[PDB]
A paper describes a structure:
IL-17A and IL-17F are highly pro-inflammatory, “signature cytokines” of effector T helper 17 (Th17) cells, a distinct lineage of CD4+ T helper cells of the adaptive immune system that appears to play an important role in clearing pathogens not adequately handled by the Th1 or Th2 immune response. Human IL-17A and IL-17F map to the same chromosome and are, with 50% amino acid sequence identity, the two most closely related members of the IL-17 protein family. All IL-17 family members (IL-17A, B, C, D, E and F) are homodimeric glycoproteins with a cystine-knot-like fold that lacks one of the canonical disulfides found in bona fide cystine-knot proteins such as TGF-β, bone morphogenetic proteins (BMPs) and nerve growth factors (NGFs), among others. Here we present X-ray and site-directed mutagenesis data on human IL-17A/F that provide first detailed insights into the molecular architecture and receptor recognition properties of this heterodimeric IL-17 cytokine.
Following crystallization screening, monoclinic crystals diffracting to 3.3 Å and containing two copies of the IL-17RA complex with IL-17A/F in the asymmetric unit were obtained at pH 7.5. The two copies of the IL-17RA complex that make up the asymmetric unit are essentially identical, and overall, highly similar to the published complexes with IL-17A29 and IL-17F28. Notably, the same stoichiometry of one receptor chain per (hetero)dimer is observed again. The binding interface is similar in size (2373 Å2 of total buried surface compared to 2,219 Å2 and 2,294 Å2 for the IL-17A and IL-17F complexes, respectively) and comprises the same three main interaction sites as in the IL-17A and IL-17F complexes, originally referred to as Site 1–328. Unexpectedly, the crystal structure revealed binding of the receptor to the “F-face”. This came as a surprising finding also because Site 2A is open while Site 2F is masked by the flexible coil in the free cytokine structure, and a large shift of this structural element is required for receptor binding. When we compared the two IL-17RA complexes with IL-17A/F and IL-17F it became immediately apparent that Sites 1F-2F of the heterodimer were highly similar to Sites 1–2 of IL-17F. Notably, the key salt-bridge interactions involving Arg77 and Arg72 of IL-17F and Asp293 of IL-17RA was conserved in the complex with the IL-17A/F heterodimer. While IL-17RA induces significant conformational changes on the “F-face” of IL-17A/F, the “A-face” shows virtually no structural alterations except for small shifts within the skirt region (flexible coil, F-chain N-terminus, and β3-β4 loop of the A-chain). Hence, the crystal structure reported here reveals only one, selected by the crystallization process, of the two, topologically distinct, binary complexes that IL-17RA can form in solution with IL-17A/F.
Numbering used by the authors:
A (entry chain F): 46 to 158
B (entry chain A): 44 to 52, 64 to 154
C (entry chain B): 33 to 303
Write the structure that this text describes.
């Protein structure tokens, strides 16, 4: 079976199957990492998802064993490029597009070059 | 179902205290076809000398992402949206130790 | 961020014919905007509860409460989508409520609750209640969101929860470091009912210097279901050094529930 495929576009059924049903308990480590970070909720009412969580590195450097910052080590953001759907309007008329959004998922600690 | 316009608008794994190895998650129907799923190299973190400090944990960062699968599996531009779990990187945390 | 029971979840209220189940967090109202949108939920409040399954397991559940506003927009209310967002992973979960019988009075104010979203200990979630139809492009909000925070397994009613216990919240190793004659150490500890390995982590120090004179690590492999809860003992030969006497033994579990990030248990032996 195949639908009538129209030109210069795509058919996007939105029935999103979550083939990845985790079953691997994750936690709030953002506070514990050597490169700690804060989370910010992002709301774009004309996007799907409307809510995107971006992370922000707490410092320029990595926190040590005593609890103070170490500048000889750098705190770097680790990014994941994902897809979002974008709703646009000219007026009553509504268009749909796919956008690539780079999301900062958290911070890791790297030795400089 | 929505008609969408066809135009879809660094080396930390080796450098990081908590380093990782990228694994080939290949799929001919799904877009992106290949996704690199990062898996932690050690249980612990790499210390100031270059050895593993087992008094530290190397845990991975995980994310939900939007991918598109070809639906039907053969058709050209007919896709169905998919949600998946991806291990992106590893960070190094301090473990929760309970004393006596 | 899993639903509780695929049971016949009910939202049916007196004077309100209601039905609930599963949704992709993308509604027809977002793709196809309806002109007359209803007003935002009033006084949203998420509070932590626990749930007991027919199997006898106890789980933390996000208890979503809300009401609606007095205004005339009520007649144009068709349902409500409820999102739960895991901040760390961006993991979304939604349930829509389909109002079959339209609400037309306000004689009695309507109050709403959902308590099936199961939430994991020590976490952060943005719980949103979106009224449906969603507002037209460049329309006013119409939803409400609240940041909900679940506590760690140190929390009283938390450490008796299934997810906590499974990550050894109620485990006690009763860890004991008895000194042996030929400058050795027997390390005694009780084991958990999971066939995962453990790691003993020795860090000997002088009498006050807080820097390791000797550091050793030893692997205790996965016990069989027989060896579950039965006390294990490992004898290790110490560094035969003067002053290097004040020991620190740290047993680390590797339970599936945490993998590495598990709770370690520390013992400190003097001279
Ligand atoms: C990053 O976060 C800093 C600390 O606050 C966090 O708040 C969280 C609340 O959910 C959570 O408790 C976490 O553990 C905390 O670390 C913010 O720093 C604060 O900034 C204020 C001024 O804006 C000061 O008055 C505070 O003293 C200061 N906190 C500290 C620890 O000094 C940062 O502003 C924030 N930065 C970004 C980029 O989000
Ligand atoms: C492990 O032991 C605890 C306490 O006896 C119990 O809650 C748990 O269900 C046990 N699990 C197994 C698989 O024995």
């Amino acid at each position: 079976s195949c639908p009538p495929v129209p030109g210069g576009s795509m058919k996007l059924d939105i029935g999103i199957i979550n083939e990845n049903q985790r079953v691997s308990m994750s936690r709030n480590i953002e506070s514990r990492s050597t490169s700690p970070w804060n989370y910010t909720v992002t709301w774009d009412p004309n996007r799907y998802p409307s809510e995107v969580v971006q992370a922000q590195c707490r410092n320029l450097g990595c926190i040590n064993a005593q609890g103070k910052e170490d500048i000889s080590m750098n705190s770097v953001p680790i990014q994941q490029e994902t897809l979002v759907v974008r709703r646009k309007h000219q007026g009553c008329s509504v268009s749909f597009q796919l956008e690539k959004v780079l999301v900062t998922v958290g911070c890791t600690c790297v030795t400089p070059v | 179902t929505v008609m969408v316009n066809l135009n879809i608008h660094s080396d930390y794994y080796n450098r990081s205290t908590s380093p990782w190895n990228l694994h080939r998650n290949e799929d001919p129907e799904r877009y992106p076809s290949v996704i690199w799923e990062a898996k932690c190299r050690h249980l612990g973190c790499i210390n100031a000398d270059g050895n593993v400090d087992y008094h530290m944990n190397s845990v991975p960062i995980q994310q939900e992402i939007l991918v598109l699968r070809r639906e039907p599996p053969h058709c050209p531009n007919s896709f169905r949206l998919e949600k998946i779990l991806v291990s992106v990187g590893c960070t190094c945390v301090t473990p929760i130790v309970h004393h006596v | 961020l899993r639903l509780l029971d695929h049971r016949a979840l009910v939202c049916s209220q007196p004077g309100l014919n209601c039905t609930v189940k599963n949704s992709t967090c993308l509604d027809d109202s977002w793709i196809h905007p309806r002109n007359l949108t209803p007003s935002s939920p009033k006084d949203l409040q998420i509070q932590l509860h626990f749930a007991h399954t027919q199997q006898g397991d106890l789980f933390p559940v996000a208890h979503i409460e809300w009401t609606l506003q007095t205004d005339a927009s009520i007649l144009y209310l068709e349902g409500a989508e409820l999102s739960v967002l895991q901040l760390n992973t961006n993991e979304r979960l939604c349930v829509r409520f389909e109002f079959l019988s339209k609400l037309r009075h306000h004689h009695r104010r309507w109050r709403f609750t959902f308590s099936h979203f199961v939430v994991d200990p020590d976490q952060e979630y943005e719980v949103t209640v979106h009224h449906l139809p969603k507002p037209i492009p460049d329309g006013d909000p119409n939803h409400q969101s609240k940041n909900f925070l679940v506590p760690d397994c140190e929390h009283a009613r938390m450490k008796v929860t299934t997810p906590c216990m499974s990550s050894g919240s109620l485990w006690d190793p009763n860890i004991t470091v008895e000194t042996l004659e030929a400058h050795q150490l027997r390390v005694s500890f009780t084991l958990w009912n999971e066939s995962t390995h453990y790691q003993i982590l020795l860090t000997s120090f002088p009498h006050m210097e807080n820097h390791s004179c000797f550091e050793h690590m030893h692997h205790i492999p996965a016990p069989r279901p027989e060896e579950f809860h039965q006390r294990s003992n490992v004898t290790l030969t110490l560094r035969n050094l003067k002053g290097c006497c004040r020991h620190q033994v740290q047993i680390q579990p590797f339970f599936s529930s945490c993998l590495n990030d598990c709770l370690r248990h520390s013992a400190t032996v003097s001279c």
